[PDB]
Enzyme design. Structure first.
Site, short mmCIF file in Angstrom:
data_model
loop_
_atom_site.label_atom_id
_atom_site.label_comp_id
_atom_site.label_asym_id
_atom_site.label_seq_id
_atom_site.Cartn_x
_atom_site.Cartn_y
_atom_site.Cartn_z
N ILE A 80 0.80 -1.22 0.00
CA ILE A 80 0.00 0.00 0.00
C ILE A 80 0.84 1.28 0.00
CG2 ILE A 80 -1.81 -1.20 1.27
CD1 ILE A 80 -0.97 0.30 3.79
N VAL A 112 9.06 -0.18 2.56
CA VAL A 112 7.74 -0.45 2.01
C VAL A 112 6.66 -0.63 3.08
CG1 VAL A 112 6.42 -1.90 0.46
CG2 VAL A 112 8.85 -1.57 0.08
N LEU A 161 -5.57 2.80 8.01
CA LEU A 161 -6.70 3.57 7.52
C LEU A 161 -6.86 3.19 6.05
CD1 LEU A 161 -5.82 5.28 10.09
CD2 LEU A 161 -7.09 7.13 9.02
N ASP A 165 8.11 15.42 7.18
CA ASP A 165 7.75 15.16 5.80
C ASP A 165 6.26 15.03 5.56
OD1 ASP A 165 8.43 14.72 3.06
OD2 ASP A 165 8.17 12.55 3.36
N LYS A 186 2.75 15.41 3.75
CA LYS A 186 2.32 15.39 2.36
C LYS A 186 0.99 14.66 2.29
CE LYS A 186 5.77 12.67 1.15
NZ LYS A 186 6.64 11.72 0.39
N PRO A 187 0.22 14.89 1.22
CA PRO A 187 -1.07 14.23 1.07
C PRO A 187 -1.04 12.72 1.32
CG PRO A 187 -0.93 16.00 -0.47
CD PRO A 187 0.43 15.90 0.17
N1 5BN Z 1 3.59 7.66 2.76
C1 5BN Z 1 3.72 6.44 1.96
C2 5BN Z 1 2.75 5.31 2.43
N2 5BN Z 1 2.60 5.14 3.92
C3 5BN Z 1 1.44 4.62 4.63
C4 5BN Z 1 0.24 4.44 3.86
C5 5BN Z 1 -1.06 3.93 4.38
C6 5BN Z 1 -2.18 3.81 3.47
C7 5BN Z 1 -2.23 4.12 2.08
C8 5BN Z 1 -3.52 3.86 1.60
C9 5BN Z 1 -4.26 3.40 2.66
N3 5BN Z 1 -3.43 3.38 3.77
C10 5BN Z 1 -1.03 3.62 5.81
C11 5BN Z 1 0.13 3.81 6.54
C12 5BN Z 1 -0.13 3.43 7.91
C13 5BN Z 1 0.90 3.56 8.84
C14 5BN Z 1 2.18 4.04 8.40
C15 5BN Z 1 2.46 4.41 7.06
F1 5BN Z 1 3.69 4.86 6.77
C16 5BN Z 1 1.40 4.30 6.06
N4 5BN Z 1 -1.46 2.99 8.03
C17 5BN Z 1 -2.08 3.08 6.76
O1 5BN Z 1 -3.23 2.77 6.54
#
Ligand code: 5BN
Length: 271
Positions: free
Chosen positions: A10, A14, A70, A114, A116-117
């Site tokens: 997601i 990673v 989320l 950092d 960001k959207p």
């Molecule tokens: N900033 C790059 C991606 N990081 C996270 C993404 C998500 C996410 C993307 C689409 C749905 N969810 C999540 C997410 C997280 C905890 C820590 C993270 F870095 C990210 N919990 C999440 O749901």
């Protein structure tokens, strides 16, 4: 870790959507590879507007961080609202909530660094949360002091980033879509005018400051984020101040008149 089952990637260390084989709970796994328990404090940094760090599993030559999961990030939500445009009440609520989370961790002397959207997550309850705090590829949201070499920057860099995001939600376009450091710095200077000692004392003493930087005038903030109202533009204006010391703080931002009629709308999400 054999306790977790991947569901899908997601985020790109990673991030995966995982299912704790035992608790049966779904979470987000951050897989890190390439010595500070700055993370141990982050673990206790709990707030309704901050994605929760559930666990830290250090084993072998990897470091997995288990987080609350989320369903959607602000970027995906923005593109899904591209033609309609995120309604202002929803924009206001979001801004307000993020400022709550920032005010919280900032009072704990912790910066995101950092914003960001894609690091902002939303649910179906109308909540928005800060995710993926960085520790001490897009430059679109980097505050100017960082771009100028400030080694020891303050909490004010998160406000700058959030201001950029605020501006993006309203206009549906990046405020400063720079594609290199100088380009980012110059798109900033073109909009707010090149910083000088008048509006930003000590700026010319910044490590990467160059007396040769072109000198642009500050364009009207009315051209920057239309058709936002006076209150909104007043708040953005203060979040975007060049001088970190004059830039508004999260806490004080909460009291800006812009949040007088703030409510908590529930977004229509297409999970
Ligand atoms: N900033 C790059 C991606 N990081 C996270 C993404 C998500 C996410 C993307 C689409 C749905 N969810 C999540 C997410 C997280 C905890 C820590 C993270 F870095 C990210 N919990 C999440 O749901």
């Amino acid at each position: 870790m054999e306790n977790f089952q991947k569901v899908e990637k997601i985020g790109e260390g990673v991030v995966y959507k995982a299912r704790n084989k035992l608790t049966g709970e779904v979470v987000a796994l951050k897989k890190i590879r390439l010595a500070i328990r700055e993370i141990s404090l982050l673990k206790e940094l709990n707030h309704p507007n901050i994605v929760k760090l559930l666990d830290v599993i250090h084993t072998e030559n990897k470091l997995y961080l288990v987080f609350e999961f989320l369903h959607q990030d602000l970027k995906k939500f923005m593109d899904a609202s591209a033609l309609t445009g995120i309604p202002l009440p929803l924009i206001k609520s979001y801004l307000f909530q993020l400022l709550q989370g920032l005010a919280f961790c900032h009072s704990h002397r912790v910066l995101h660094r950092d914003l960001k959207p894609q690091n902002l997550l939303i649910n179906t309850e109308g909540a928005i949360k800060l995710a993926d705090f960085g520790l001490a590829v897009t430059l679109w949201y980097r505050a100017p002091e960082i771009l100028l070499g400030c080694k020891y920057y303050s909490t004010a860099v998160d406000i700058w980033s959030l201001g950029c995001i605020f501006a993006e939600m309203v206009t549906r376009r990046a405020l400063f879509p720079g594609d290199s450091e100088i380009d980012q710095l110059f798109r900033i200077f073109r909009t707010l005018g090149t910083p000088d000692e008048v509006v930003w004392p000590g700026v010319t003493s910044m490590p990467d400051y160059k007396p040769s930087f072109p000198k642009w005038a500050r364009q009207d903030f009315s051209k920057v984020v239309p058709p936002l109202d006076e209150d909104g533009r007043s708040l953005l204006s203060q979040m975007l101040h060049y001088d970190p010391n004059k830039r508004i703080s999260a806490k004080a931002a909460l009291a800006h008149p812009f949040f007088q009629d703030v409510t908590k709308p529930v977004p229509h999400l297409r999970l």
